[PDB]
């Protein structure tokens with residue numbers, strides 16, 4: 001792979017969003033990955049509806065504000081034949097009945113790819129595909145309070161992830177030979193969290209916080 005990647009600079013990434021007090025992280029992770037792949041296919045970046053996924057993707061296994069998986073969201077888009085735009089189907093931070101309208105669909109996918117569970121494969125996918133949906137262990141106050149720099153939490157688990165986010169690139173701080181490496185991660189807690197809503201997460205430390213444990217992207 002390249003030494004560093006940032007897909008924001010290539011037009012693949014919408015602004016940071018805010019899931020509110022709803023356990024819909026998986027929906028924001030899924031729309032981010034689909035936004036990236038639809039841009040790769042068409043050259044147009046269009047913000048996608050998390051509310052459409054929250055309300056409508058139960059049949060694929062999601063549970064609205066009580067949690068879900070990005071792969072189940074990619075399966076819904078395939079099954080349904082579409083996903084509405086954010087503008088047409090705005091986010092309400094609470095589960096409601098399904099109001100999908102095909103007139104306003106702006107995305108589709110034909111399934112998904114699960115990445116092998118290690119960071120060299122994750123890096124290859126980020127470099128060759130675009131932004132990648134991942135699950136991490138975010139369940140520490142250090143993550144809530146993160147401000148800047150490379151996040152490393154001694155008690156992070158590589159097995160027990162609870163929060164879905166989006167890898168948009170990677171790189172290094174300091175001189176290269178220090179191996180001060182990070183994943184560039186878009187969160188869905190608003191731009192006041194973190195570094196404008198982003199976090200750099202420890203890279204190449206044996207899958208810190210599980211970032212390579214449940215990584216995937218949609219096939220468009």
Ligand SMILES: *[C@@H](O)[C@H](CC(C)C)NC(=O)[C@@H](NS(=O)(=O)c1ccc(F)cc1)C(C)C
Pocket residue numbers: 022023024025026065066067068069070135136161162163164
């Ligand atoms: C993010 O907002 C979600 C918060 C949970 C506590 C509702 N996290 C998830 O949906 C996670 N998916 S899951 O399948 O692991 C899960 C975990 C705990 C739950 F209570 C429900 C579902 C995340 C890994 C996407």
